[PDB]
Enzyme design. Structure first.
Site, mmCIF file in Angstrom:
data_model
loop_
_atom_site.group_PDB
_atom_site.id
_atom_site.type_symbol
_atom_site.label_atom_id
_atom_site.label_comp_id
_atom_site.label_asym_id
_atom_site.label_seq_id
_atom_site.Cartn_x
_atom_site.Cartn_y
_atom_site.Cartn_z
ATOM 1 N N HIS A 111 0.806 -1.216 0.000
ATOM 2 C CA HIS A 111 0.000 0.000 0.000
ATOM 3 C C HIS A 111 0.844 1.273 0.000
ATOM 4 O O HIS A 111 0.286 2.377 -0.083
ATOM 5 C CB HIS A 111 -1.001 0.025 1.158
ATOM 6 C CG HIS A 111 -0.394 0.074 2.525
ATOM 7 N ND1 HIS A 111 0.321 1.159 2.977
ATOM 8 C CD2 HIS A 111 -0.500 -0.771 3.577
ATOM 9 C CE1 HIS A 111 0.704 0.946 4.223
ATOM 10 N NE2 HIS A 111 0.199 -0.210 4.621
ATOM 11 N N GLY B 10 2.995 5.856 10.286
ATOM 12 C CA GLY B 10 4.298 5.644 9.697
ATOM 13 C C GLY B 10 5.002 4.401 10.181
ATOM 14 O O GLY B 10 6.153 4.160 9.774
ATOM 15 N N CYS C 272 4.066 1.417 9.508
ATOM 16 C CA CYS C 272 3.864 0.350 8.534
ATOM 17 C C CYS C 272 5.203 -0.175 8.049
ATOM 18 O O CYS C 272 6.136 0.595 7.836
ATOM 19 C CB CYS C 272 3.057 0.876 7.350
ATOM 20 S SG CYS C 272 1.513 1.579 7.862
HETATM 21 C C1 LIG Z 1 -3.868 2.578 2.529
HETATM 22 C C2 LIG Z 1 -4.335 1.855 3.796
HETATM 23 C C3 LIG Z 1 -4.091 0.351 3.613
HETATM 24 C C4 LIG Z 1 -5.841 2.087 3.957
HETATM 25 C C5 LIG Z 1 -3.579 2.408 5.011
HETATM 26 C C6 LIG Z 1 -3.592 3.767 5.309
HETATM 27 C C7 LIG Z 1 -2.921 4.287 6.401
HETATM 28 C C8 LIG Z 1 -2.188 3.439 7.255
HETATM 29 N N1 LIG Z 1 -1.446 3.943 8.374
HETATM 30 C C9 LIG Z 1 -0.198 4.507 8.366
HETATM 31 O O1 LIG Z 1 0.311 4.920 9.406
HETATM 32 C C10 LIG Z 1 0.526 4.660 7.106
HETATM 33 C C11 LIG Z 1 0.320 4.235 5.823
HETATM 34 N N2 LIG Z 1 1.384 4.681 5.087
HETATM 35 C C12 LIG Z 1 2.197 5.350 5.920
HETATM 36 N N3 LIG Z 1 1.729 5.360 7.149
HETATM 37 C C13 LIG Z 1 -2.203 4.094 9.614
HETATM 38 C C14 LIG Z 1 -3.627 3.388 9.507
HETATM 39 O O2 LIG Z 1 -3.714 2.160 9.388
HETATM 40 N N4 LIG Z 1 -4.733 4.134 9.587
HETATM 41 C C15 LIG Z 1 -6.079 3.585 9.389
HETATM 42 C C16 LIG Z 1 -7.121 4.681 9.556
HETATM 43 C C17 LIG Z 1 -8.528 4.135 9.330
HETATM 44 C C18 LIG Z 1 -8.645 3.477 7.968
HETATM 45 C C19 LIG Z 1 -7.612 2.379 7.806
HETATM 46 C C20 LIG Z 1 -6.201 2.922 8.027
HETATM 47 C C21 LIG Z 1 -1.597 3.566 10.911
HETATM 48 C C22 LIG Z 1 -1.748 4.253 12.111
HETATM 49 C C23 LIG Z 1 -1.185 3.761 13.267
HETATM 50 C C24 LIG Z 1 -0.499 2.571 13.196
HETATM 51 N N5 LIG Z 1 -0.370 1.855 12.063
HETATM 52 C C25 LIG Z 1 -0.916 2.367 10.943
HETATM 53 C C26 LIG Z 1 -2.181 2.069 6.961
HETATM 54 C C27 LIG Z 1 -2.857 1.581 5.861
#
Ligand SMILES: CC(C)(C)c1ccc(N(C(=O)c2c[nH]cn2)[C@@H](C(=O)NC2CCCCC2)c2cccnc2)cc1
Ligand SMILES: [Cl-]
Ligand SMILES: [Cl-]
Ligand code: NA
Lengths: 305, 306
Positions: free
Chosen positions: B41, B143, B145
């Site tokens: 992603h 961040g 991920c």
């Molecule tokens: C594109 C996709 C798959 C929906 C996504 C988007 C953002 C992230 N998250 C990144 O932090 C992130 C992504 N790229 C850089 N950072 C964060 C995340 O899941 N928020 C969620 C908010 C609700 C909807 C699903 C995603 C995250 C936060 C804290 C700890 N873990 C991860 C993970 C996945």
């Protein structure tokens, strides 16, 4: 989100651990530049440990009485001396993995990461706090002596603890890296016991702030208090006195969450007087006191090294 | 003596963490030999989050659209491929710090260490368990991920988890290093939720054995139980079923302490009934379920405090 007991990454310290053998005793040493640091009781027999004269035992020893093994390589000992309860063995090779480092002595209530080691090999890492009674509730088996505790600030390792012994209650005692014991303990087999411990109040408050940041709010209430009134409650429940310095340190978390320290102190005051009513805080049924304010901000802000 | 949540030393994994950037998105990758692994992603834009087609998004990328940074060194990407939900970037330099390693897929109840990283830089290490509902109760910020979970039994790093996303309850979902998710989750922003979770019964029993090894017996009783009667009671507290495999796994701890597995099950039944009455077990006022039988043997003495 989430909240876990978290240790510093241990790689910079792993590259410093060696095995030190004197006679039939084997334990761990810390290899920095061209010196290896370990507990001075490595030079003692079981007979010696009852009433050791470390001055005389060491003058007896010579460089060739010590075997230092770094992985599979033997380090040649070219000198030896003592600083307080730490033995210093000069070797012919500087550790090429030596990190930027300082020796630091910590205060009760402060936390650090412990790298538990056996036969010079790192085995595990966990987070500890220096208790008000100067013990640590570690996890150590025979052969763990010489394992070290540390903090990291950017790229600099601050070494603060070297493990020396277990007390009869199963808690642990040791020294700073200059060989000065934390607490009223000595490195000889004699009658010794941990004193009655107290709870680290400023750390409990920090953890309550962490709980609010993570959405746990049931313990908040409309009331505030004063230091004087709260500290009378603290003494009642064997909590460390809360000082004005502690209030200032928690200032950041108070501003972020909207709960003044004395506001949060009113929550803690009520938790001590009434209990938790079957509820948990951050997945615990006890009030946790081994997270510092710094630990909470770091983990809730993602600081890297 | 003592008993702590203990992680593996993280140095072998620290030397593999890098930063991966695509467009405006930055996260962590795992550099092993000449390949960098990261969540696919990273190639999603703002409006690709609900229904991305990763095949269509990736075919539009050139090698130079991926920026890989190892500390201060830029690594040149010379190829890329997708394996399930993981992106594999081939780089022109093999990681000289690559440890002995293998990829393993774990089962619910298994534990592992997590090296939480941001911008390719390690932040901290902690212990986790794969919950019965295929989530982990991690500590992860934006961040994180691409941070990984691992064990290091016998000097070999077994990578078992790569972090992808956070669910609405604040727990975390990810994949193995072949890119297959644990549980029914998908790397899309569509409404997904963790199922009702349960307690890992075999681990609670392991931790009760740890308590006995450490010198504590207050919670034992004079009773035993059949396996079926135990499961009938434990499931009323949202405990996972205990299988004969679990009973077999607990054999060595039973032998060391002299307490039959089904006698320890009887103690657990009573603890669920009564609580602890102001007491603690290994410093906890709740029953802990993120130590496995293998973990207890790893950490505890081979000699019981009788
Ligand atoms: C594109 C996709 C798959 C929906 C996504 C988007 C953002 C992230 N998250 C990144 O932090 C992130 C992504 N790229 C850089 N950072 C964060 C995340 O899941 N928020 C969620 C908010 C609700 C909807 C699903 C995603 C995250 C936060 C804290 C700890 N873990 C991860 C993970 C996945
Ligand atoms: Cl002396
Ligand atoms: Cl498994
Ligand atoms: Na209040």
């Amino acid at each position: 989100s989430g909240f876990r007991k978290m240790a510093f990454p241990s790689g910079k310290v792993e590259g410093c651990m060696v095995q030190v053998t004197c006679g039939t005793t084997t334990l761990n040493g810390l290899w920095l530049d061209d010196v290896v640091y370990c507990p001075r009781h490595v030079i003692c027999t079981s007979e010696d440990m009852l009433n050791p004269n470390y001055e005389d035992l060491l003058i007896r020893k010579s460089n060739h009485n010590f075997l230092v093994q770094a992985g599979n390589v033997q380090l040649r000992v070219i000198g030896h001396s003592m600083q307080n309860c730490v033995l210093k063995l000069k070797v012919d090779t500087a550790n090429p993995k030596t990190p930027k480092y300082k020796f630091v002595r910590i205060q009760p209530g402060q936390t650090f990461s412990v790298l538990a080691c056996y036969n010079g090999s790192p085995s595990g890492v966990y987070q500890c706090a220096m208790r008000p009674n100067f013990t640590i509730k570690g996890s150590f088996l025979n052969g763990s002596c010489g394992s070290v505790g540390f903090n990291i600030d950017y790229d600099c390792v601050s070494f603060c603890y070297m493990h020396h012994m277990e007390l009869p209650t199963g808690v642990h005692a040791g020294t700073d890296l200059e060989g000065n014991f934390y607490g009223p303990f000595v490195d000889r087999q004699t009658a010794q016991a941990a004193g009655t411990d107290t709870t680290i109040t400023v750390n409990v408050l920090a953890w309550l702030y962490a709980a609010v940041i993570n959405g746990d709010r049931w313990f908040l209430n409309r009331f505030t208090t004063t230091l004087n009134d709260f500290n009378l409650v603290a003494m009642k429940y064997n909590y460390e006195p809360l000082t004005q310095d502690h209030v200032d340190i928690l200032g950041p978390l108070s501003a972020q969450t909207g709960i003044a320290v004395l506001d949060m102190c009113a929550s803690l005051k009520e938790l001590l007087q009434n209990g938790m009513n079957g509820r948990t805080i951050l997945g615990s049924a006890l009030l946790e006191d081994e997270f510092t304010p710094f630990d909470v901000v770091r983990q809730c802000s993602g600081v890297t090294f």
